[PDB]
């Protein structure tokens, strides 16, 4: 229920790291935020998600991102279950998980049976929600879309520009990153004047600020979230 | 605001095709249907989006998805914004678009300036919401995501099974689905002693009941969405 | 609920596709008196006649003192488009902001707000921020700009005189350009009134003068000339 | 208060000529009423809106409109106000007027102090409120201007058209009348194939279906708007 | 609004201009009597219009200031004295409130406006004294308001109630009441001086207002009693 | 309670005894005048009460009843009434309201008790017709209370209004008003009819009172300017 | 509705003997008062009761008593009962009597038809309640057992001595006053142990402290209630 | 706080006699019942008033009336103070005492610490509080002055009469009985006219319709009150 562009509700959360506050743990070390929910422990679709972020932890640390689970369980709970998935899928879960036994925070965020405790919010440097996703509990995140989601958040923010469908893959504008556009008669036609940008209306402007290194970055996302692994840690247990 | 698992609001809406009632309209044709929701006409971001939904909207029939955009403006403009797009994108978008002057619909939904008209709800032949995804008024969808969600969803439905992270492409079971696991000791018990499934523990087995067809068609969504095009509209 | 004549214009800042403005103080400011005008969606055919109206009648209202400001259901995007339209097609640069107004916000705190075919009343707002007039033509039966001309140009004059301005000015079949003084509201003063024998009277309470110039007064004329006679040229064809 | 599209409020009202309900009174007998009012009885502006508005009975009358006045005063004031007009102007007003002390029929139709008791709502033959004008006190009327109105809504109602600003003399179309818009893509698409109209775009489309005789009317009420009187009721005195 | 309590506060639009009641009069010491109408050129409210105007020095000879409520607008109310003075040959020379949307009447307790015709009579603080309510198809007796204002003033300037029907009561003439005692120990000590005629010791009375008090208030009655001599229509 | 207004329903309890008002007056076609006193054993009060007493036939020839109403008990009402017999030689004839609590006077508007001094003329329809305060300090006047409900059926009867001073009008003497036309077709015709005396459309008056009538009106009002011969505190 | 123990409720009221401030009026001369209540004037209970306490007037006096009535009629109604008792009974009622018309006092006190309005108040010097008694309209009170109350609280009040049913003529114990009960386990051993008082258990342990004198005049009360009068008031 | 005159509160309570329904359960007998409150029990003037009540008891029933004890204490507690009663004092309590605990009965009849639980409530045989008193902890009651009410007030309801102050003893009229007063005009002269009763006023008439035997037994309540006992139960 809190909507995009407000601040991420302030809390002091328990978590299997210890107590912290939110978003001002994140905020005081210029660090974005995924947080992510999960009806219980010791669940298959939450599991799999959980070694999802975990094999990408070093790609969103890369890009000041941390992570942060909640599920309605105990810590004690919360500890075993990161127990059993480094002991049987052999994945250490690196990031702190939420405890959140009586729902209180899935309550403060709206997100409360506890089925529909699946809320992930990506939350900025600022404390501010930035984007959020609601998969529900039988549909695994693809969390590659998470990384590009932040990525070309940053991107956008860095570059004052905003990021056009499916980038950098847009079918229209391609690797194109698109000028927020003008809001008056006067600021329209001084853009069109300037000759400054790619243009297909003077509400529709563009040019390609993206480094070849940022644009390679968000597609190996995309990549990465399309290739079958050759190997399977099934069968490596 | 209304979520997961709860039915679509029952509401009248005016589209640039006419009056229509929600979810009813899609429901009684026993379709699914994406409503995606955008801040206002004339608009580079949504007109992005509108052309990838677009250029996919085979795949959403192919899937039995219907497709229904909402923005807040009049139909007038909706049906201006539209002919500019086919015009100068080159691209007739062929699915209706919910014009809600006055945000009606946007406050009905939790929507609701209009920044935060931006949600996507993905409702199932029951009429229930399945997924809502809210990408902020600066940031594109990922359009083929949208199309693994509906598919993913429908198998899962069929199968009588979960889905897992990052499927048909998931790091521990790869194409497999999960089964919805054992609440009870008894029936947890039952489960390992059957064989039945590849399994981790007793909460986590699985097994892969879905199609080459489907399997691949789900990862078809992901080698697009992960393409470079070979043309760009803007250039054609 | 709208607000009535005599009342101040409701504070509030608005969106236009000029920019963001604080009403009535970007006028009151300017010692300027504004027309807002008011419509139920862009790219619609009765209100395009009337920006067009304005339009050309924009020299006009600039010459008394009075801005002009329109305000309709859509976003300010749709604002620009419609405008862009206008002036390709029609071949007249609509001047004058126009209030974006998704949601509604501002029609409904002006009382002119579920279809948004109510949005459609007229305020003529003197340099106080005040309220003087106000004008509800339906949808479907669009405005006649040089009455609202009239309207100002007679309001400004009687300010300035201090007179009431009869029915159909400055063509009243009674007193024809005259304009009236305020009635008295005590005996004495109008007894006082008639006994100075200093105006053209019918009644102590119906005494009047012609205090207008010649020039505001054939002002005021053609404008309602204008409305009366067939146009030489249709936008349209030329 | 009530607004355009509005049925006018039910209410039995004492008039000059008795008691009437509104709107009944009128609809009961297929007329269109223009309910117009005042601070006060023994006013200048009024007397001059009263004598404008009895000089143009006829024309109300042949288009079948019936006009009702309200004054906050009572009915002994009223006809002592219309045996004035008779006497020194020679004019006879031949309408009703509503009785209306203690303010209670101005209050219903948000009017109401009383120098803010100067609305117009010109009401047709359904019952339903039409237009509203708002001249202040100080500020009287042009009655022409509410024969065209009366003239080119009937029109309009009649012919199932909108009419444009300025009618007849519109300077984009002149005497034409504009079809309502197309509301679905088909409709306007379908609109444009069928060469039915002259049209600018298909949400622009129009025709000149009023009868000259119609025409020339309308433009009659502005021609005697415009010219200057050729003998003032003051001199006939 | 009850007898002994305060007029009402309030600014009041005149035919003679604004005015604070009861302020206007109560700065000049004035006694005022306040006499309502449902509307104006109605034919009881202009005979008790006469009636106040043909008695207009009398009220001045006791300090006592006249002033009408009508619900209509001043440009009425001039034009209705106008018509009076033109047709009757009187004319009326007291303000009449405007009250248009009845403000005034409803604040006074008086509201179709058939009820408003309330007589308020108000001494010189500013307190109800007396009210009367006549219906609107019954002119008042205005030589009764006199008798009540010259009796209230003798009754306060003497310390004295005033008997029924005075200067003409049935038991004792004009003599005036003495309040009565209120403690076992005033009525005891009251009997005992034979200061006063007695009933009783809570009737108590004698005489001390003037011959010249006495026969005014009784003038007043005469001349309520007489046929006219000459009639104004004639 | 306005003129105008029904007189409020109640049972009141009365030195004659219990009766409800003011349908034991309706019901027999008799008006009543109702008189309120702060107490009993008051000494304008008693002067009142006497002036009533001695013009008991005058309202009885008139068809109206008299009732009184003082906050002091029933017992309290016979022994004042005893008292003035007694000390005065005036027998009073009508019921007194026993009004202790003050719940009668309360239920009137009137209400220490210095404010419980409301006349009430109700007619035989129940309907309060006049209201007369005058102070606890200021008695009554009698005879104009039998000119008023004289005057009042006279124009009920004769459907008339009744101008200032009846019948010692200054303008049109005796004479009485018809009720002004309320429409300008009306007034026309009446003026047209010349069938009144007229000074305007809306004052018209004649003279249809008989000469018993207005005689009648004119002793009353003889009566209270003329000085009693005896006073009955002399007799006594 | 004030209990026993409370302070007498502040208030203003009227009295046959002027206006005076309750229970001040009384607490500030040190006096102790008892206040009795009557529906009307003119009433024969009430009349055989007020001749009562005044009787027996000189004996409150004699204690620091003061006699106050309460009766719903007026201040002049009050004077003229009282006038007409020392008339036809010959005994002058020397107390004043609370004018409550409109019930003021009665209904601040519990007591409100005005039948109810019978309480009897008996106050102390520091205005506290310190007995009620509810005699009905239709009975008259005791007025001796008054005369008892007020002595026997005055003097447990100053022995610090409760006082048994029936005293000076309790059945137990005669004209023994009892100890107030110890309230602690200590303090009833200690009692037990002291072996100072008579007793039959620690909770009732009882002496004999008061005067000869407090008990004559105690006992006398009642002799003088027992008594049937030598002479009936009636006969002259 | 329910007032002479009003029903008394209908309550179902635990007395040591067990669950009874009050007033029903006297009314159902055609009794009268004087119910009597106290604070505590193990508290000697409460003590003191039972013994009394206990003395006269068959005075109480002779007059068909019934009694009740109240107080804020157990059954179990009721039943030893009584057990108490009869060994030390030697006199048997015959009647029911109301357990209170948590004061919900007192609280009901406006009673209520608990020293304010003290009101005696004297009922009648319709279920009507007829009388009540309010003597406080500190101070036993006159119980001889509770049988001359009882006496007195079905005396004033057989014979339709009014009783005066102090009566039979009363000192302008003796054992009369006052008639209730006119309350019109009409019936106070007609009374006058009658010539049947003696008077001093219209308001103010009686005579002595009550026999002989039931002016002497108010009478002896009296005489008893005022007699001291030759021996006391202390001895």
């Known amino acids: 229920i809190p909507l995009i562009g407000e601040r991420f509700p302030e809390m002091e959360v328990t978590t299997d790291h210890g107590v912290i506050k939110l978003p001002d ?42 992570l942060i689970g909640l599920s309605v369980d105990s810590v004690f709970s919360h500890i075993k279950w990161k127990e059993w998935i480094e002991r049987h899928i052999g994945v250490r879960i690196p990031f702190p998980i939420i405890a959140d036994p009586q729902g209180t925070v899935a309550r403060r965020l709206g997100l409360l049976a506890t089925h529909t405790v699946r809320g992930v919010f990506i939350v900025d440097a600022r404390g501010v929600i930035r984007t959020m996703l609601y998969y529900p509990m039988e549909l695994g995140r693809l969390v590659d879309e998470i990384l590009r989601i932040v990525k070309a958040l940053k991107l956008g923010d860095s570059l004052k520009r905003a990021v056009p469908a499916d980038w950098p893959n847009n079918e229209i504008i391609g690797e194109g990153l698109i000028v927020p556009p003008p809001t008056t008669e006067d600021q329209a036609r001084a853009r069109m004047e300037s000759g400054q940008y790619r243009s297909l209306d003077w509400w529709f402007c563009w040019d390609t600020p993206a480094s070849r290194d940022d644009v390679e970055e968000a597609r190996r996302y995309l990549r990465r979230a399309a290739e079958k692994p050759a190997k399977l840690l099934y069968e490596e247990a």
């Open 25 to 66: 743990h994140y905020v005081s070390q210029g660090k974005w935020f995924v947080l992510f929910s999960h009806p219980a422990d010791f669940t298959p679709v939450c599991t799999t998600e959980f070694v999802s972020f975990a094999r990408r932890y070093e790609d969103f640390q890369r890009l000041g991102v941390d």
